Write a protein that binds this ligand. Structure first.
Ligand SMILES: CC[C@H](C)[C@H](NC(=O)[C@H](CC(C)C)NP(=O)(O)CNC(=O)OCc1ccccc1)C(=O)O
Ligand SMILES: [Ca+2]
Ligand SMILES: [Ca+2]
Ligand SMILES: [Ca+2]
Ligand SMILES: [Ca+2]
Ligand SMILES: [Zn+2]
Length: 316
């Protein structure tokens, strides 16, 4: 909407206070004009019609319990935009500052979040399995990264390409979590998963097997559930990414870590210059090796470490 840029204040899902960019025209709307062509946050009102209504507030204060998921979706979309712009020189998900839209309060007791082809969508969770999912910065960045993937590599959402698609979202979700630097880790969704259980998460990149996911190609799932295991086989690639960044010895194969920043550069380049809609794991290895070669040289430690990591997870 047309109005003047303002700054509201509120509390997120975890009870933390933060400032948010809003727009004033009669009401204060969750519309951040400071980033690209805007970040817009909508109320789905417990229903499934999307996007719902652009979030409107009378006083620019967002401290109500109902406000919390909107505050976080809006704010973390901002952080994710900043990461892509500042770190990778990418302007929004399409590279041309496309408007970023999110809806919160989607459905009732909805234990998931997704990119629907056009926008991000967040359930509130059922209160036991999840609290409102926009409370997780890794979750928000995971979702926006699906949009980035769809506009770039276009990885088909099934089987190996789909598992790469998922891993890319977990990798950048995690790198954005580190970028924000609040309780960062290599786990996925820990901030919003199972409020009654401390120390768990949906997936682990450092040890995918902790939550039953494969950490070696020999353990890949080849059934039909979960689009051919896209959230399961992602563990194999997540493990490789973790090893590239942090190093370690995995099934006897030692990897020299090169750090998060280089992991991000290598995978961002692979995603945007080499991967295609049908890339499989072997092709990702080749794309990552080539990306590291472009950035650091064929004889570099970085290239050697990428090879070691894929060797460690059984991908040739
Ligand atoms: C409990 C939910 C699982 C952890 C898992 N979901 C996830 O891992 C994440 C959310 C976490 C980061 C919190 N959601 P996602 O974006 O991967 C769900 N994906 C999805 O719904 O894709 C199907 C689709 C939906 C709309 C249009 C095209 C394709 C799943 O859907 O299996
Ligand atoms: Ca208010
Ligand atoms: Ca964390
Ligand atoms: Ca995390
Ligand atoms: Ca928990
Ligand atoms: Zn996903």
């Amino acid at each position: 909407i047309t109005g003047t840029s303002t700054v509201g204040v509120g509390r997120g899902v975890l009870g933390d206070q933060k400032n948010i960019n809003t727009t004033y025209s009669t009401y204060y709307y969750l519309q951040d004009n400071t980033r690209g062509n805007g970040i817009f946050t909508y109320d789905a009102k417990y229903r499934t019609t999307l996007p719902g209504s652009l979030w409107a507030d009378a006083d620019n204060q967002f401290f109500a319990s109902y406000d919390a998921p909107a505050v976080d979706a809006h704010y973390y979309a901002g952080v994710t935009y900043d990461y892509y712009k500042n770190v990778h020189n990418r302007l929004s998900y399409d590279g041309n500052n496309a408007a970023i839209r999110s809806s919160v309060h989607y459905s009732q007791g909805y234990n998931n979040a997704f990119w629907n082809g056009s926008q991000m969508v967040y359930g509130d969770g059922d209160g036991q399995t999840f609290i409102p999912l926009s409370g997780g910065i890794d979750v928000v960045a995971h979702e926006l990264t699906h949009a980035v993937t769809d506009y770039t590599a276009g990885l088909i959402y099934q089987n190996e390409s789909g598992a790469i698609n998922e891993a890319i979202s977990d990798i950048f979700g995690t790198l954005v979590e580190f970028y924000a630097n609040k309780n960062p880790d290599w786990e996925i969704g820990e901030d919003v998963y199972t409020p009654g259980i401390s120390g768990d998460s949906l997936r682990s990149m450092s040890d995918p097997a902790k939550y039953g996911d494969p950490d070696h190609y020999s353990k890949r799932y080849t059934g039909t559930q979960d689009n051919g295991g896209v959230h399961i086989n992602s563990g194999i690639i997540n493990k490789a990414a973790y090893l590239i960044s942090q190093g370690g010895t995995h099934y006897g194969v030692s990897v020299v870590g090169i750090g998060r920043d280089k992991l991000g550069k290598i995978f961002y380049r692979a995603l945007t210059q080499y991967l295609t809609p049908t890339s499989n794991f072997s092709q990702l290895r080749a794309a990552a090796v080539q990306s590291a070669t472009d950035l650091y040289g064929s004889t570099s430690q970085e290239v050697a470490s990428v090879k070691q990591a894929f060797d460690a997870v059984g991908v040739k």
